[PDB]
Ligand binder design. Structure first.
Ligand SMILES: CCCCCCCCCCCCCCCCCC(=O)OC[C@H](COP(=O)([O-])OCC(O)COP(=O)([O-])OC[C@@H](COC(=O)CCCCCCCCCCCCCCCCC)OC(=O)CCCCCCCCCCCCCCCCC)OC(=O)CCCCCCCCCCCCCCCCC
Ligand SMILES: CCCCCCCCCCCCCCCCCC(=O)OC[C@H](COP(=O)(O)OCCN)OC(=O)CCCCCCCCCCCCCCCCC
Ligand SMILES: CCCCCCCCCCCCCCCCCC(=O)OC[C@H](COP(=O)(O)OCCN)OC(=O)CCCCCCCCCCCCCCCCC
Ligand code: HEM
Ligand code: HEM
Lengths: 380, 267, 15, 72, 101
């Protein structure tokens, strides 16, 4: 007699990763958002399959295809709104996941954080190109403005403009390249997510206290299994509450018109999770400076593990850095609000002050705060 | 004073048995007991009757982690019926199905007990032993094993499977083997004067009478696989066990895995 | 001594 | 890897079955003071940045509605 | 001075690891130097440290803290890991200085 669960060639992988995996006992609900992110990605692909296998997206009548989806296809409105609000809920859960890692000292895992930064780049790209795809009015204007941003760099801007666009305005094949790697790139996201899981399984999980959790660890089943099921049901409640009661709350009406290049939009913005990033393009008065400002913001997010000058990992015992952290979180909220509002007085100077406060908090203020915290603790 | 009044209120003649086994004349010992033991002061001095409060079995788990010990001991026990219930006799046969094993056993691999065979075949335990302790209206029926740390979880699974086999897959062959083993146990134990006298004293204290060994044989012969498996379903299936551990017991599971493993999902 | 220990009162949690 | 994670000596853990204990043992009457304690211990570090940025938002919208007002 | 000592004690109380019964040296992030600082500890300090971490995790799991009589006050939070960690840091520094030349 042998144990089936520990000798099967396929089931030892699933129980070593799922059943008898030792996890910290004192894990709060925040880590559950990470699991939510995974299943959110899955339902996106499911809706994405339902956005291709019945549908005929065109380079010229994409908007007509989309309204025929919403009207003349059974449950097409439901899957379209689950795709849009699942992208919104994916960015909500991703922001909470990144904030969890940023707050509880989880950036001490090097390669896990680095491939997380790669995953963040990938989901930014997929969300922007999916927003480009249905060919609305302001979707067209946002695509035109940001391809004018990216056309400045020689041999990789211009050549890919002529590669992803047959012509600058419209010709016989325009949006199929956008559709092509908006189709394929979430599977690279799923592959990088299983690499994320593999590296975390190599290094183990982290408790909110930031200590060595090896004294008290429990099996993942059935505690965190039922905790994840409860979190998934709550997330699906909120997700189709946003889908099925308030479908155009996180959205906007300005992309519910057909694209017309002769007609300018009065107020132009991206989607909400891009909005603060758009504010940085309104901060520095340079297009290349704005592009490098976006890359520099996600690069200092990647560079945050090198700025940990404190000998305490988590921030449960770090009140000064906690205050700085919540100032930073409210600063990103102000940056989203500023990126929503158009370019006038004094939103320009609120954008300048918010961007320099964001960069000063992440770069210099937090390690000096950690040095002050360590000096006040009789450590050095 | 505590020893004095404890001895005063607890050493009383109606709660006392003078037992003898061996080359003894009964009339002579009765005369000598009437000569010597007829001064007890059996009257209640303070009129305080010590009654037997019915104890409650609570499913719980205590674990004493200490990793410098070389081997880990784990005992798992569910509530037993008691002395007066005959069903423990059937449960005795159940223990004779499961048996015991040590590292010094000369049987090797071909032992009839499947848990002992899988313990020697997979190198699981230093030893295991099945026990059935009975108290007034209660008791503990279960197993105790000493093993290294890195096997503990696996061995627990095997033990639970054997118990659930007694719920479902009891056949005539292992029931007959357990009956023969229990017959040899209850006749072979009562050899010499000391264990016979011990049996006499414990029988007149627990059952209130000395059960003859022919009556034990009649009770043993009455069992078959159907009633053994329904008593095992009555006392083991979907029950809350009591788990005690001492040693390197990090791989000893929680209460939830043991409680889930004490019922199969197929029925 | 192992006899010096006993379980705490779980009266606030028990039914 | 249960069994070779850490080395702990002389610790005793007591636990109960879930079937011999209450699922919500004094839920509200022992949960409200702990929630109030956590809120009192964390709101002084969480809330004031949110209050200041609410003030910033209200000032910005007040200036936007006060932008021209038919200037004399 | 005296006011700096008062704000230091107030910051120690507001840090919040005395509510969980933790000492000051228990909260250090386990880097490599801290790992061979723990590895050079005697058995009783190590056992008390492991019990303190396990009790802190148990209290954090239920979102509870110790009663105020059981909190770690300022005078008994001694520095037991400090000589081991400082000599580990010193020997790592001289190893780096040897490897530099
Ligand atoms: C006054 C208000 C009521 C206060 C009250 O009843 O307090 C008692 C009690 C006090 O608890 P405690 O004494 O502090 O100790 C238990 C802890 O709360 C920790 O235990 P817990 O019971 O909070 O469980 C951990 C956590 C586990 O969290 C999850 O499973 C959710 C994970 C996150 C999902 C996020 C979805 C997306 C969100 C986007 C924004 O549970 C919840 O978050 C509760 C989910 C309730 C769902 C609806 C149930 C009906 O409060 C609660 O149990 C809070 C939830 C009440 C429902
Ligand atoms: C949510 C609002 C704040 C709620 C709150 O009060 O949280 C307190 C909690 C810290 O409490 P803690 O110290 O862990 O426990 C004490 C137990 N005695 O705080 C926490 O647990 C906070 C955990 C989440 C932190 C991040 C929240 C913001 C998420 C967005 C971050 C965006 C980062 C950048 C992304 C784009 C680039
Ligand atoms: C006093 C009691 C009041 C309530 C009465 C009822 C009693 C409730 C129970 C109270 C129990 C005691 C307090 C327990 C909480 C823990 C201690 C605490 O939080 O203290 C207050 C804290 C002091 O600072 P601390 O980190 O402790 O360190 C001091 C070292 N100098 O100081 C703070 O946290 C203050 C932080 C203020 C931060 C303000 C930030 C404003 C600016 C944000 C801008 C963000 C956006 C920028 C935009 C730029 C462009 C415009
Ligand atoms: C590989 C699977 C996916 C496929 C095949 C796919 C395909 C599509 C298609 C055809 C559209 C246009 C239909 C519409 O606009 O409603 C679309 C829109 C969109 N997609 Fe995807 N998508 C996939 C995954 C994702 C993921 C993972 C995200 C999130 C990052 C995402 C974000 C979006 C967004 C934001 C829109 C715009 C919705 C709107 O019009 O408001 N997609 N996608
Ligand atoms: C692309 C979407 C993402 C998915 C699906 C994802 C998925 C997961 C999952 C399933 C876990 C394990 C559950 C847990 O314990 O939290 C996890 C943990 C983690 N993730 Fe992600 N993740 C994503 C993005 C990111 C990003 C962008 C970062 C970097 C900021 C990141 C950093 C981490 C860290 C540090 C942990 C370890 C938690 C800890 O032990 O402290 N993840 N992620």
């Amino acid at each position: 007699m042998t144990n089936m669960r520990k000798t099967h060639p396929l089931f030892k992988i699933i129980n070593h990763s799922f059943i008898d995996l030792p996890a910290p006992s004192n894990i709060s609900s925040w880590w559950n958002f990470g699991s939510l992110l995974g299943v959110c990605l899955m339902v996106q692909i499911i809706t994405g399959l339902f956005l291709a296998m019945h549908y005929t997206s065109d380079t010229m009548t994409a908007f007509s295809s989309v309204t025929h989806i919403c009207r003349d296809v059974n449950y097409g409105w439901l899957i379209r709104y689950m795709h849009a609000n699942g992208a919104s809920m994916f960015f909500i859960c991703l922001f909470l996941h990144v904030g969890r890692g940023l707050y509880y000292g989880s950036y001490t895992f090097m390669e896990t954080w680095n491939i997380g930064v790669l995953l963040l780049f990938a989901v930014m790209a997929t969300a922007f190109m999916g927003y480009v795809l249905p060919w609305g009015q302001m979707s067209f204007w946002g695509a035109t403005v940001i391809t004018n941003l990216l056309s400045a760099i020689p041999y990789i801007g211009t050549t890919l403009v002529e590669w992803i666009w047959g012509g600058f305005s419209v010709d016989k094949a325009t949006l199929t390249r956008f559709f092509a790697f908006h189709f394929i790139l979430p599977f690279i996201i799923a592959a990088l997510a299983i690499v994320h899981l593999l590296f975390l399984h190599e290094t183990g999980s982290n408790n909110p206290t930031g200590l060595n959790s090896d004294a008290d660890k429990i099996p993942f089943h059935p505690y965190y299994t039922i905790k994840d099921i409860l979190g998934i049901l709550i997330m699906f409640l909120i997700l189709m509450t946003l889908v099925l009661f308030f479908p155009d709350m996180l959205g906007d009406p300005d992309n519910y018109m057909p694209a017309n290049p002769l007609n300018t939009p009065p107020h132009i913005k991206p989607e909400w999770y891009f909005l603060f990033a758009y504010a940085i393009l309104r901060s520095i008065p340079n297009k290349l400076g704005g592009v490098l400002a976006l890359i520099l913001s996600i690069l200092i997010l990647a560079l945050m593990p090198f700025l940990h000058t404190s000998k305490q990992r988590s921030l449960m015992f770090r009140p000064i850095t906690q205050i700085l952290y919540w100032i930073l979180v409210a600063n990103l909220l102000i940056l989203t609000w500023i990126g929503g509002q158009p370019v006038e007085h004094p939103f320009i100077i609120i954008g300048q002050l918010a961007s320099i406060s964001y960069f000063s908090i992440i770069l210099i203020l937090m390690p000096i705060s950690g040095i002050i915290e360590d000096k006040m603790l009789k450590l050095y | 004073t505590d020893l004095t009044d404890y001895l005063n209120r607890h050493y009383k003649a109606p709660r006392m048995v003078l037992a003898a086994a061996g080359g003894v004349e009964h009339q002579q010992l009765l005369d000598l007991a009437q000569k010597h033991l007829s001064s007890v002061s059996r009257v209640y001095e303070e009129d305080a009757v010590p009654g037997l409060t019915p104890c409650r079995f609570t499913g719980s788990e205590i674990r004493h982690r200490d990793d410098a010990l070389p081997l880990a001991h784990v005992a798992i026990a569910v509530e037993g019926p008691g002395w007066a219930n005959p069903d423990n006799v059937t449960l005795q046969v159940a223990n004779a199905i499961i048996g015991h094993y040590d590292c010094t056993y000369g049987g090797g691999v071909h032992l009839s007990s499947p848990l002992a065979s899988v313990a020697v075949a997979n190198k699981l335990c230093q030893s295991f032993q099945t026990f059935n302790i009975s108290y007034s209206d209660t008791g503990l029926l279960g197993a105790h094993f000493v093993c290294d740390a890195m096997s503990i979880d696996d061995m627990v699974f095997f033990l639970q499977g054997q118990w659930m086999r007694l719920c479902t897959s009891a056949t005539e062959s292992e029931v007959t083997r357990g009956k023969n083993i229990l017959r040899n146990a209850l006749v072979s134990h009562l050899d010499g004067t000391t264990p016979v006298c011990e049996d006499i004293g414990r029988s007149l204290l627990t059952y209130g009478r000395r059960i003859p060994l022919a009556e034990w044989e009649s009770r043993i012969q009455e069992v078959d696989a159907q009633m053994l498996r329904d008593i095992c379903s009555k006392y083991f299936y979907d029950q809350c066990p009591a788990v005690a551990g001492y040693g390197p017991i990090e791989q000893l599971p929680d209460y939830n895995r043991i409680r889930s493993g004490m019922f199969w999902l197929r029925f | 001594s192992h006899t010096d220990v006993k379980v705490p009162d779980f009266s606030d949690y028990r039914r | 890897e249960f069994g070779n994670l850490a080395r702990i000596r002389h610790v005793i853990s007591y636990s109960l079955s879930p079937f011999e204990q209450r699922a919500f043992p004094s839920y509200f009457s022992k949960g409200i003071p702990n929630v109030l304690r956590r809120t009192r211990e964390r709101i002084l570090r969480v809330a004031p940045p949110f209050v200041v940025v609410y003030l910033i938002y209200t000032w910005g919208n007040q200036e936007f509605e006060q932008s021209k007002r038919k200037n004399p | 001075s005296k006011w700096l000592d008062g704000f230091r004690k107030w910051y120690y109380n507001a840090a919040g690891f005395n509510k969980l019964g933790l000492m000051r040296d228990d909260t250090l992030h386990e880097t490599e130097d801290v790992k061979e600082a723990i590895r050079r500890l005697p058995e009783d300090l190590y056992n008390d440290r492991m019990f303190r971490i396990k009790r802190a995790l148990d209290l954090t799991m239920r979102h509870q803290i110790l009663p105020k009589d059981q909190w770690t006050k300022y005078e008994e939070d001694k520095f037991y890991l400090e000589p081991y960690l400082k000599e580990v840091i010193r020997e790592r520094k001289e190893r780096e200085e040897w490897a530099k030349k």
